[PDB]
Amino acid sequence: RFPEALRLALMLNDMELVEDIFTSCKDVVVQKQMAFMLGRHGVFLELSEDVEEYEDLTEIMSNVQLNSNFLALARELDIMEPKVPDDIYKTHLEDSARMNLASSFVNGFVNAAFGQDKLLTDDGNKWLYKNKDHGMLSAAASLGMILLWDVDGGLTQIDKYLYSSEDYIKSGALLACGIVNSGVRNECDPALALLSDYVLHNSNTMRLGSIFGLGLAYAGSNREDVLTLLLPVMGDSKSSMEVAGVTA
Amino acid sequence: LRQTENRATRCKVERLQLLLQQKRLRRKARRDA
């Protein structure tokens, strides 16, 4: 009973035992099923082009198809309608940085990976104009959430419309990439490479955002590359204690 | 600093688009099989 065998294998915190249980792979169907569980739990499998169904199992675990499947289910009983903060509210029943960012957060929460698109651009321009005090990268990371798991759409949209000046907007791009890649496994490092590139930038807040995005893009991956890239730069005497804490 | 940083950002952006198109190609190739 490989599926629940693997469930208890994960329950017992021993990745070696989990790998041993997964090794059998006597049935293609059950093999793919347990690969699905491993991917969903985010436990990182380890192998290469050395076994049957290696490619499809790798894609299953990496969760490359999660966004497409989610969008397909949404289409089934289509829910791809952006909603105005008030519409999520009902203000009809009866603009500082504070409520501007609050509304942006509400929109990002409600529209999760639905590709707000037109409302996305509208609210993007709104909070870009309302850039003030804390009207910082926050809203860019919000766009990142609206494009959560949307490696294609999220990365494309941020790339074409983001960056430039306003190191806060560049940190917004970094955190948007991190959010898009969050819980998204793939050998490609669209978030890792960028955040490692801009990790060493002097700007304290932008570096903080870059490191936060790097951590949260592959949170739980448990690999060692980013750990080796980050632990040396743990020393934050040249930076702030908040930067030290967020890197931790 | 601003100009060089933005130029490097854009260069990285084209490299990332190259990676993204490579990913699309491989993913669709494996999907169709």
CB contact under 8 A, B24 and A194: no
Query: How many beta-carbon pairs under 8 angstroms link A with B?
Result: 40
> What distance in Å separates the CA atoms of residue A138 and residue A104, rounded to the nearest whole number?
9
CB contact under 8 A, B16 and A156: no
Query: What is the resolution of the experimental data for this entry, in Å?
Result: 3.9
How was this structure determined? It was done by: cryo-EM
Q: Is A90 helix (H, G, I), strand (E, B) or coil?
A: coil
Q: HEC states along chain A?
A: CHHHHHHHHHHCCCHHHHHHHHHCCCCHHHHHHHHHHHHHHCCCCCCCCCCCCHHHHHHHHHCCCHHHHHHHHHHCCCCCCCCCHHHHCCHHHCCCHHHHHHHHHHHHHHCCCCCCCHHHHHHHHHHHHCCCCCCCCHHHHHHHHHCCCCHHHHHHHHHHCCCCCCHHHHHHHHHHHHHHHCCCCCCCCCCHHHHHHCCCCCCHHHHHHHHHHHHHHCCCCCCCHHHHHHHHHHCCCCCCHHHHHHHC
Number of CB atoms found within 10 A of residue A120's CB: 22
Residue A39 token pair? 């991917």
Rounded to the nearest angstrom, the minimum Cα separation between B30 and chain A is 8
Contacts of B28 in chain A (CB under 8 A): none
Contacts of B20 in chain A (CB under 8 A): 151-152, 155-156, 188, 190
How big is chain B, counted in residues?
A: 33
Q: Which residues contact A189 (CB under 8 A, 6 or more apart)?
A: none
> What distance in Å separates the CA atoms of residue A136 and residue A232, rounded to the nearest whole number?
28
